[PDB]
Amino acid sequence: KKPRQKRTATKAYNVTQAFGRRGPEQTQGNFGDQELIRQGTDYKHWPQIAQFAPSASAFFGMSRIGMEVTPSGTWLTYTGAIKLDDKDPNFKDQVILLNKHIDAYKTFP
């Protein structure tokens, strides 16, 4: 049993199955429209999204890390920010793509 953070979503084991329903609560992810949720790393523009995901070294190097204990369990918390390069020729498209998936679930029928 690989832990949740090591899972990879695909068409046969999708974002909802691996990582739960999209939503606004603290423990929920909010990222992905219906196409990305159904397809995971098979999504047509997945590489353009993954360019922004951190390496293990960067995850622990760039982030503010903490530990919290709640009734549900013991949690390693993380927060940070990643600058988009507005000198990148593909900047405008990167922004459009990220905004299409952030909080997409709010307009799901």
Q: Which pair of tokens denotes residue 85?
A: 């390069």
Tell me which of 8, 24, 27, 57 binds ligand A1H88, using CB under 6 A: 27
User: Any idea what DSSP says for residue 4?
Assistant: G
Q: Does 50 bind ligand A1H88 (CB under 6 A)?
A: no
Amino acid at 20: G
Residues 6+ apart with CB under 8 A from 22: 15, 16, 28, 29, 30, 31, 32, 37, 104, 105
In the complex with a second copy, the residue whose CB is nearer, 25 or 109, is 25
Q: Does 70 bind ligand A1H88 (CB under 6 A)?
A: no
Q: Does 64 bind a second copy (CB under 8 A)?
A: yes
How far apart are CB 39 and ligand A1H88 at their closest, in Å? 21
Q: Does 4 bind ligand A1H88 (CB under 6 A)?
A: yes
